[PDB]
């Protein structure tokens, strides 16, 4: 007896492609690598309950290649497999609402993702790939599994791998529309004079070296090619936020002077992030956990600030 069922294949879970599969052969023998809501069914034969269901496959014809690129803005051949592998885990995570924001219950070293997700919900940012647009909308509503799996895939991190928040934000920002963002800096050395530089896009909203936006405006000390220490300060800023990052160090966060921040306790190869948000008071969100305080001091590694347009007064 020959037995078949109808299923649909997809790369973006929107555009469906009708298929007829032989129930005596595995999905892999018929489609190549195949996934059912994240689960790898490549070595599995069709079941009756599969009729009418949607399966992800790899982009193995030109139609799927175009659909995949338009949705994800990547042509990495291993992307869909990494996204599905992550999703099979992230769909089992829990996403509690904590102080009005979608968080993530701790699992699989996902603290860096929780902090990143909580941060995104407090800054003005639009994603460019439809995959991220669609999944971020769902994440804001509380169903963040597909968004978290996409972050992992885009960042080339597997579930359980230790992650860095600054690096993760850099990747997400690279897939965001920051074309309107502009930064002008000036650098003064007593021996070499001045040099002004203009930064755009991701480099216009991120800085590595100090956590304090105010000190960035007053001036920070850096090396120069001659051997002297030069001073760098912010001349002009056009962006809806800025992100200031530094190696973790004890730092005091004062209510009302920042938007949110990331706290890291541990060492290079192992640690834990928490999220601090400045609202009516200071709330510390640690996955599902919530505490509050009027003051905060801790090992801070990233601080986010509101912005619109800033121009210096330094002459
Ligand atoms: O993140 C930064 N660049 N990102 C690059 C990238 C490519 C793909 C993913 N990320 C970055 C670079 C700098 O030179 C900074 O001075 C800085 O603050 C940030
Ligand atoms: Cl978006
Ligand atoms: Zn110099």
Residue numbers in the entry: 1 to 315
Reproduce passages from the article:
The hydrazone compound H1 binds in a polar groove at the S1 site of PLpro between β-strand β8 (M206—M208) of the palm and helix α7 (V165—H175) of the thumb domain. In this groove H1 is stabilized by eight hydrogen bonds. The central carbonyl oxygen of H1 is the hydrogen bond acceptor for side chain of R166 and again S170, while two phenolic hydroxyl groups of the terminal benzene substituent are hydrogen bonded via one water molecule to the amide nitrogen of M208. Further stabilization is achieved by C-H···π interactions between the phenyl ring of the compound with the side chain of E203 and the pyrrole ring with the aromatic side chain of Y171. At the core of the ubiquitin binding interface around residue I44Ub are four non-covalent bonds between ubiquitin and PLpro (one hydrogen bond, three salt bridges), all of which are likely disrupted by binding of H1. Interestingly only the hydrogen bond is lost due to direct sterical hindrance (M208/G47Ub), whereas the three salt bridges (R166/Q49Ub, E167/R42Ub, and E203/K48Ub) are disrupted due to side chain reorientations towards the bound ligand. While the hydrogen bonds with G128ISG15 are likely disrupted by the sterical clash of H1 and the ISG15 loop comprising residues F126ISG15 to P130ISG15, the interaction between N151ISG15 and R166 is impaired due to the movement of the arginine side chain by 4.0 Å that forms a hydrogen bond with H1 in the complex structure. The hydrazone H1 is binding directly at the center of the S1 substrate binding interface, interfering with residues R166/E167 which are highly important for substrate recognition. While the thiosemicarbazones show no inhibitory effect on substrate turnover at the tested concentrations, a significant inhibition of the ubiquitin cleavage can be detected for 500 µM of hydrazone H1. Surprisingly, ISG15 turnover in the presence of 500 µM of H1 is not reduced but rather increased twofold compared to ligand-free PLpro.
The papain-like protease (PLpro) of SARS-CoV-2 is essential for viral propagation and, additionally, dysregulation of the host innate immune system. PLpro can revoke these PTMs by hydrolysing the isopeptide bond at the C-terminus of cellular ubiquitin (Ub) and ISG15, which results in a dysregulation in the production of cytokines and chemokines and type I interferon response. PLpro is a monomer in solution and has a right-handed ubiquitin specific protease (USP) fold which consists of four domains—the N-terminal ubiquitin-like (Ubl) domain, the thumb, palm and fingers domain. PLpro binds ubiquitin and ubiquitin-like proteins at two distinct sites, S1 and S2, thereby providing specificity for K48-polyubiquitin (K48-Ub2) and ISG15.
